[PDB]
Write a protein that binds this ligand. Structure first.
Ligand SMILES: Nc1nc2c(ncn2[C@@H]2O[C@H](COP(=O)(O)OP(=O)(O)O)[C@@H](O)[C@H]2O)c(=O)[nH]1
Ligand SMILES: Nc1nc2c(ncn2[C@@H]2O[C@H](COP(=O)(O)OP(=O)(O)O)[C@@H](O)[C@H]2O)c(=O)[nH]1
Ligand SMILES: Nc1nc2c(ncn2[C@@H]2O[C@H](COP(=O)(O)OP(=O)(O)O)[C@@H](O)[C@H]2O)c(=O)[nH]1
Lengths: 334, 334, 334
């Protein structure tokens, strides 16, 4: 029977179905790059309340949300509209992430479409029973108080309908290249973003020097509460050791990780990458979290990655370590 | 791309998408006429719990609701059944008004299908984020106490899922042609209805001596609370002046309009209609509402409208001026 | 018009649309038999969280629920998973029972897919406004305390989204053939089940010596609260009298029926079945319930039913007569 045959086939699926949804201009901007630089095994869905941005975007599926609310003309920086536009198009959004086993909601918090629609796309995803993960940034302080109070509130809302929520405070990007002209500001942030997102998807989707079990990912990530990134990499010949300290020290991991469970580690390096450098990476890390943290890791080889090995680090469940003030992420004072 | 092309096209839409849903026998009866006399740019959806009436109706789309509840055999005057039949067919109803920018729910309150299903079609419409407007009548007192207590309760329910709700008390039709035999009763009511409904749709959809901005309509109507009609027209040569006083005095505007915001004014007249008579119309009106009422108006020319100019008047947000007793609309006593 | 023609046709439907949904292994097992032995006018839908069982099943439609939650690999005896798998696939489940006028949810309570998914399929059915009926069993005591505490809780949950819920305690199967080896245990239970389910469907769907009005069924069954079965049959020549006492005495009707309203009686017999034996059957029964119980009955002739007449008995609204302890159905002590 065509139903039995279909059933049989189902059992043969070997790969997890990952869909990436970018919201608003920045999120669409991100989707456009993954769609070009390629995002190993993942479909891209861009959703915007602004038709012009949506149109100049490159994605697998485009959805103009808020068609009656907005008119294809933007949400004017208003999270309330981003939200209704998304609520108004729930069906359509859900129909795009419907078959995904895992869904990543990415965007720049602070605007109206992203800040308002991300929590909506997230709650819709959770309903269809998918692994809901958000890799989202916080505005630069230069952008002002209203942009951040809005970003904060969005983060809070996004917290409730998210399995794991990865926050990247653009402000620390300045702790990485101190005298950056706002120009690069958003170009650096663009980079960090595409890394955090691609680093995570491939860690789960790209064949490495280890089989990384989606069932494990789902296990851990199912409870990443509030996670934070760490990126590091060494040109030198003591790579692993330097790439993981860089990472463990990135100003992006702006949190006290001592009391942290779960972690996802992706070491990427050239063909001369060793399962041992990977392990070095993993233990230097394991050595700093709760003694029982569940750690997911993988190791992939990157063509264009010269003599270097990057080390993406996603430390989860740090929400008790942080303070959600409507002025930003404040490292908790107990 | 077919998605981009589509997106582009979207931006070119110039006309608001209006769908008119008539519920129950009277509502279906109304839809049948708009479908014939033509309702400038608006699709008609008739929904009934009675297959026989539905069948003899003329509409763009027909929906037999309550197919399992009822069996295509009516709701026997019961609002409770009108409601479940509609709740039972929500999906189907929603699929018919799904793309509308604006939805009009029309019916004769007092029966079972209309009284029960109108609030359901209204809440469904609001969910899809459309401009939900109801042009609905109240039964004649001859019909009795049960018919009205049911109509009242329906009006209340309809209040919660409606952007603006236009009430037409058939009882005042007698204040217009005093010794009317019940025959005409429903023939007069039929007229007033088709006017209130067509007058409003064309005001928004028919090209006049002024561009009427749907964005303005949505603004005002988005808050018409409880509205009431006024119809007037003058054969004479001081038209505007006579047509707007007639209107301002119609026994149908059975409410204290002094404290009213928003209003929609549609003056229709022969080709010799002036933008000035229209303005006369509008100011005589503006002069009687809150000094800051938002007034939407338009002016269209009607072929078959001899030497006359009709003046439809929809005064909104008068709900504080009225008393909802389960015996009818009582002009509030503060 | 194709819409009018369609409407017309609708009015001509003469038969109620019955869909039977079996959940989990036992439920799928049951569906497989009705699908083969044939279930007079009823479509079969098998739903399972385990692909292997689903595949070896025979049904009109198969649905693998919990595809993201479970992975086509079972629910491991967990009701919590049976539930999420079903909640996760609500749309798909609903799309299969969507046009039914009546829906039967059948399964063996105690496992994870059935116990968890039956209440979900039931609440979904009630939403589409269908006659929701469950013919479900309770585990044998040999299976242990956890299997039953889970079955009990499922029964409770199933109570809330069910029009009438028919419980068959497998434990009393031993009061019928006392020294049964667990082998037959489940083979006897298999029989009783296929009878209770087919007996009820045909009583409503198979042409007998009486027109049984679906409108009556819906009336009664709409309020069967907690029902219990009785099966009996006589080889002899005083059939009716013996078949109805057997039935009235079956250890399966483990409840005090004196205070019971409604009942459904299906007497099946050979071609020499009399409308009078049927009436004998019905009055011996009527004589023992509340003096105003609404009794639905029918009478059908069965080819392969030698000189015998079976008598299926479904006595409804006995929930006040029973005690729901998380160790089984205890005949209430007031
Ligand atoms: N990385 C990155 N962030 C951006 C970019 N443009 C804007 N943002 C950030 O994202 C936030 C929202 O901007 P935008 O994406 O335009 O918002 P929306 O379209 O209204 O949802 C801002 O507060 C910025 O910090 C961009 O090109 N790259
Ligand atoms: N204008 C108008 N009103 C009607 C007509 N028939 C009934 N009504 C009114 O509408 C109410 C409901 O009647 P009907 O449309 O038959 O109700 P339903 O079909 O049961 O929902 C009555 O109480 C009447 O006042 C009609 O032909 N024209
Ligand atoms: N009649 C019958 N009952 C069964 C059969 N297998 C299991 N059961 C009963 O149904 C309950 C659930 O078993 P199963 O159908 O495997 O559960 P599930 O697949 O996990 O939902 C058990 O506790 C048994 O009492 C069978 O073949 N026939």
């Amino acid at each position: 029977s065509p139903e039995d045959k279909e059933l049989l086939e189902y059992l043969q699926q070997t790969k997890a179905k990952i869909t990436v949804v970018g919201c608003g201009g920045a999120g669409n901007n991100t989707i456009t790059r993954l769609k070009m630089e390629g995002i190993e095994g993942a479909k891209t869905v861009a959703i915007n309340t602004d038709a012009q941005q949506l149109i100049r975007t490159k994605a697998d599926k485009k959805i103009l949300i808020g068609k009656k609310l907005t008119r294809g003309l933007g949400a004017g920086g208003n999270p309330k509209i981003g939200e209704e536009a998304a609520k108004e198009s729930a069906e359509e959004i859900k129909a795009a992430i419907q078959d995904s086993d895992m869904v990543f909601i990415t965007c720049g918090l602070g605007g109206g479409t992203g800040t308002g629609s991300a929590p909506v796309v997230a709650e819709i995803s959770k309903k269809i029973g998918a692994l809901t993960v958000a890799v989202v940034t916080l505005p630069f302080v230069m952008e002002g108080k209203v942009r951040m109070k809005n970003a904060m509130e969005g983060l809070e809302r996004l917290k409730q309908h998210t399995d794991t929520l990865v926050v990247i405070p653009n402000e620390k990007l300045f702790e990485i290249v101190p005298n950056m002209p706002l120009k690069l500001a958003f170009k650096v942030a663009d980079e960090v973003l595409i890394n955090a997102v691609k680093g995570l998807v491939e860690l789960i989707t790209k064949d490495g020097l280890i089989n990384v079990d989606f069932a494990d990912v789902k296990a851990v990530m199912n409870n990443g509460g509030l996670a934070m990134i760490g990126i590091g990499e060494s040109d030198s010949e003591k790579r692993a050791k330097e790439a993981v300290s860089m990472a463990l020290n990135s100003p992006l991991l702006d949190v006290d990780i001592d009391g942290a469970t779960g972690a996802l580690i992706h070491v990427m390096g050239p063909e001369d990458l060793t399962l041992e450098e990977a392990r070095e990476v993993v233990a230097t890390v394991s050595s700093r979290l709760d003694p029982n943290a569940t750690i997911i890791w993988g190791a992939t080889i990157d063509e264009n990655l010269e003599n270097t090995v990057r080390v993406l680090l996603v430390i989860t469940g740090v929400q008790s370590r942080i303070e959600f003030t409507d002025t930003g992420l404040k490292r908790k004072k107990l």
